[PDB]
């Protein structure tokens, strides 16, 4: 379940309440919808719904406006066992039932009202693509989109990004799934601390952001200052464990003119 | 070492393995990347023929064949005459998701019956 097909039913117009067979609904068209999502096939429609099928309860009678439901479940949800192919075929059927609204598909008196069919290309995104289908009997206005499952990113929803702020990483999530490093961190997964400004890259290191610790033989705020050979009295250093004598001094530890 | 330090850095139920001073993720089948956060596309090899459609699933690939073709890679043109359909010594002609029975004189119908 890496990607999700969403289908929002908006408005359905069915005056007179006429079935397919030309007979009027009695007393009224208790309308529920069957949706069939399957692969793009230019040839005539064959086989089952390969992308998943779904039946809705009765939403209205004859002509009615369909409201969104956060918890029926509008817009409709179709979780996919696969990565979105890019092409699709959509089949929306309007039905009538004389039975209960709970599972209208479970009724013997079910009769078809009208149906539409569309197929083509669609790219993953939060952008709703809207479409209308008018005929002499019915009108259907709807919208649909393909989005990624939560915490999933990329053009094909093939990359996971859960935000971290612990030992394994300190980052946020970019739209493409790549980590956006929190301030004071760097790397691929933002788990490398950014040492204090000016801390010696070669002789210094850190375990926490804005810290500077000195590798053996160095000291100071920026670990850029050497420590002269142990026992160096009148001499300096450039490299740790050195004793370069000053003026008028000599000997290993610089202590004799 | 690295793995006991709380949560799991391997996201899709991958196993944490400790290296020294670091770690590496043992990814389950169908997942790649340093920490198994990327779904592997199983349909890169374009395994299926005859104008089929490849579906990238989790850990495996699935193909939808054009009508008349079958098999895992949609490699088999279905012999629609395999079941010996035409009766009473009729002749069988396989095509694509379709079969025709040559009817000897005196017999008619779909199956020449
Ligand atoms: C469908 O019918 C409506 C009438 O409410 C109209 O506004 C709309 O333009 C029609 N769609 C077409 C002609 O594509
Ligand atoms: C394991 O090694 C990776 C780099 O390969 C590093 O990012 C981690 O901090 C370490 O635990
Ligand atoms: C590429 O094709 C091979 C066929 O050997 C298949 O095993 C792989 O799963 C596919 O990605
Ligand atoms: C095998 O025979 C059956 C008859 O049951 C026919 O329906 C098939 O088309 C054929 O392949
Ligand atoms: C997948 O199914 C095959 C049969 C073709 O119709 C393709 O266009 C589609 O992507
Ligand atoms: Ca280690
Ligand atoms: Ca996959
Ligand atoms: Ca054949």
A126–B contact, CB cutoff 8 A: no
- Does residue A132 have its Cβ closer than 6 Å to ligand 1? yes
Say how many Å lie between the CA of residue A53 and the centre of ligand 3: 29
Same domain, B20 and B47: no
Same domain for B2 and B33, yes or no, is yes
Indicate whether B12 and B35 sit together in one domain. Answer: yes
Torsion (CA) B48, B50, B51, B53 in degrees, nearest 10: -30
Let me know how long chain A is: 257
Cβ(A204)–Cβ(A212) below 8 Å: yes
Q: Does B61 share its domain with B90?
A: no
Query: Rounded to whole angstroms, how far apart are CA atoms A68 and B84?
Result: 55
* CATH number of the domain where residue B95 is located: 2.10.25.10
Domain that holds residue B21: 1-40
Instruction: Confirm or reject contact between A40 and chain B (CB < 8 A).
Output: yes
Co-location of B6 and B36 in the same domain: yes
The two structure tokens encoding residue A2: 């890496």
What is the rounded CA–CA span in Å between residue A56 and residue A92? 11
Give the number of domains in chain B. Answer: 3
Give residue numbers after which chain A breaks (C–N above 2.5 Å): 71
Cβ separation B39–A159 shorter than 8 A: yes
* Cα B82 to averaged position of ligand 5 atoms, centre (Å): 26
Q: Are A3 and A83 in contact (CB under 8 A)?
A: yes
Q: In this complex, which of B6, B11, B57 lies closest to A82 when CB atoms are compared?
A: B57
A51-75 CB burial, b ≥16 within 10 A, e <16: bbebebbbbbebbeebeeeeebebb
Is A90 in contact with A118 (CB distance < 8 Å)? yes
Question: What is the SS3 assignment for A226?
Answer: strand
């Amino acid at each position: 379940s890496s990607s999700i097909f969403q289908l929002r039913l908006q408005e359905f117009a069915n005056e007179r309440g006429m079935l397919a067979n030309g007979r009027p609904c009695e007393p009224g068209c208790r309308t529920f919808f069957r949706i069939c999502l399957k692969h793009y096939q230019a040839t005539f429609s064959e086989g089952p719904c390969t992308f998943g099928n779904v039946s809705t309860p009765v939403l209205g009678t004859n002509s009615f406006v369909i409201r969104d439901k956060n918890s029926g479940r509008n817009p409709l949800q179709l979780p996919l066992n696969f990565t979105w192919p890019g092409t699709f075929s959509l089949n929306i059927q309007a039905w009538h039932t004389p039975g209960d609204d709970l599972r209208p598909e479970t009724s013997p008196g079910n009769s078809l009202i009208s149906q539409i069919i569309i197929q083509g290309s669609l790219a993953v995104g939060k952008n709703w693509k809207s479409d209308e289908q008018n005929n002499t009997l019915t009108r259907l206005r709807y919208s649909y989109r393909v989005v990624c499952s939560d915490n999933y990113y990329g053009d094909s929803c093939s990359r996971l990004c859960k935000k971290r702020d612990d030992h394994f990483g300190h980052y946020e999530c970019q739209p493409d799934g790549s980590p956006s490093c929190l301030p004071g961190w760097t790397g691929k997964y933002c788990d490398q601390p950014i040492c204090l400004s000016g801390c010696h890259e070669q002789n210094g290191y850190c375990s926490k952001p804005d810290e500077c610790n000195c590798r053996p033989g160095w000291q100071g705020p920026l670990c850029n200052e050497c420590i002269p050979h142990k026992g160096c009295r009148h001499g300096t250093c450039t490299i740790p464990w050195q004793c370069a004598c000053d003026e008028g001094w000599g000997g290993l530890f610089c202590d004799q003119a | 070492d690295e793995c006991a330090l709380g949560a799991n850095p391997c996201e899709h139920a991958g196993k944490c393995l400790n290296t020294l001073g670091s770690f590496e993720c043992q990814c389950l089948q169908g997942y790649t990347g340093p920490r198994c956060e990327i779904d592997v596309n199983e349909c890169i090899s374009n395994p299926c023929q005859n104008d089929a459609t490849c579906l990238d699933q989790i850990g495996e690939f699935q193909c939808i064949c054009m009508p008349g073709y079958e098999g895992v890679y949609c490699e088999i043109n279905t012999d629609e005459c395999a079941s010996s359909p035409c009766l009473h010594n009729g002749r069988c002609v396989d095509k694509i998701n379709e079969f025709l029975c040559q009817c000897p004189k005196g017999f008619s119908g779909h199956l020449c019956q």
